[PDB]
Design a binder for this molecule. Structure first.
Ligand SMILES: Cc1nn(-c2ccnc(Nc3ccc4c(c3)c(C)c(C)n4C)n2)cc1CN1CC(O)C1
Length: 269
C-alpha cells in the first residue's frame, strides 16, 4: 500500500463518476515526484471498497504502453487508486473541444487503442467498458486505455465471461451476444471498439443519438448499423462495420483489427 504522507491531492477536482471523484495529485517517489490521477471512493458509510480493490487487482497485472499504469492503492481518509497521470484526459471530451484535430491524428489514437486491446486479448482479460470516455490522452498523439472496474480475467478453459442483469447505460457499446446472453469476450470488446471508433471520428458525439437501448438492439437485429460520421475516412467506417459483425465467430480479433489500422495509418501518412 502507498504512504498517504507522500501523496498530495489537488483540492479542485477533475470529475465525479459512479461513485467518487478523480483528483490530480503528486506522489513522492524514491527521489523525483510523480504526477498522478487519483480515483477517490465516496463512502459516507463496505463493498464499494471491494470494487476498487478488484479494479486495482486487474491493473496490477497489466503492463503495456497503451494502458494506464497503476502506482498503487492508498488507504486513508478515503480509499484511493493512484495512477500515472494522463494529462489531457478523456478522448471523447478532448475531441469535443478540439475539432481541429485531423483524421490522421484520430487514426493514430485509435490505432494505439487497438494495440493495447491486442495486449489485453493476449492476456485473456475482457475490458467490458471499452468506449471513448475510457481512453485517456497523455498527449494529443498518445492514448492509453483506462477504467478496469468492469474488467474480468477469463478462465483458463473459456474465452468468455458470463455476467448477470445489466441496466440501460452500457447497451450502446454492447455486442448482440452481450445483450441476449450476457456473454463477454475479447470479441465483444472488438464490437465496443467499433463503437469507440465511430465516437472518435464523430469528435466525441454520443452513438445512437436519441435512441433507447431497446431501439438500438432492434436496429442491430434488423442488420442496420450507424451511418458514416461526417468527414470520416471511408476505410475507417469499413473497419467499424467489420467490428460490428453480428456473429461472434466471424467477427475479427484485435490482431486483425490492429493490422488494418496500422496499414491504413501508413497509407494516410
Ligand atoms: C479510473 C480513472 N483513471 N483516470 C485517470 C487515470 C490517469 N489519468 C487521468 N487523467 C485525467 C486527466 C484529465 C481529466 C480526467 C482524467 C478526467 C476524468 C477529466 C474530466 N479530466 C479533465 N485519469 C480517470 C478515471 C475515471 N475514468 C475516466 C472515464 O472518463 C472515467
Amino acid at each position: 500500500y502507498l504512504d498517504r504522507k507522500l501523496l498530495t491531492l489537488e483540492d479542485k477536482e477533475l470529475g465525479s463518476g459512479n461513485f467518487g471523484t478523480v483528483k490530480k495529485g503528486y506522489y513522492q517517489m524514491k527521489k523525483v515526484v510523480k504526477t498522478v490521477a487519483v480515483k477517490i471512493l465516496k463512502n459516507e458509510a463496505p463493498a464499494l471498497k471491494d470494487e476498487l480493490l478488484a479494479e486495482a487487482n486487474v491493473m496490477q497485472q497489466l503492463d503495456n504502453p497503451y494502458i494506464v499504469r497503476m502506482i498503487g492503492i492508498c488507504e486513508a481518509e478515503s480509499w484511493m487508486l493512484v495512477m500515472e497521470m494522463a494529462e489531457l484526459g478523456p478522448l471523447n471530451k478532448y475531441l469535443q473541444q478540439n475539432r481541429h484535430v485531423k483524421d490522421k491524428n484520430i487514426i493514430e489514437l485509435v490505432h494505439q487503442v487497438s494495440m493495447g486491446m491486442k495486449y489485453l486479448e493476449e492476456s485473456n482479460f475482457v475490458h467490458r467498458d471499452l468506449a471513448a470516455r475510457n481512453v485517456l490522452l497523455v498527449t494529443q498523439h498518445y492514448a492509453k486505455i483506462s477504467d478496469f472496474g468492469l474488467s474480468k480475467a477469463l478462465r483458463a478453459d473459456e474465452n468468455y465471461y458470463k455476467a448477470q442483469t445489466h441496466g440501460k447505460w452500457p447497451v450502446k457499446w454492447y455486442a448482440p451476444e452481450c445483450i441476449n446472453y450476457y456473454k463477454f469476450s475479447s470479441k465483444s470488446d472488438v464490437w465496443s471498439f467499433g463503437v469507440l471508433m465511430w465516437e472518435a471520428f464523430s469528435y466525441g458525439q454520443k452513438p445512437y443519438r436519441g435512441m433507447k437501448g431497446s431501439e438500438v438492439t432492434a436496429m442491430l437485429e434488423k442488420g442496420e448499423r450507424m451511418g458514416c460520421p461526417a468527414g470520416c475516412p471511408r476505410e475507417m467506417y469499413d473497419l467499424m462495420n467489420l467490428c460490428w459483425t453480428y456473429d461472434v465467430e466471424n467477427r475479427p480479433g484485435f490482431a486483425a483489427v490492429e493490422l488494418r489500422l496500422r496499414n491504413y495509418y501508413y497509407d494516410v501518412v
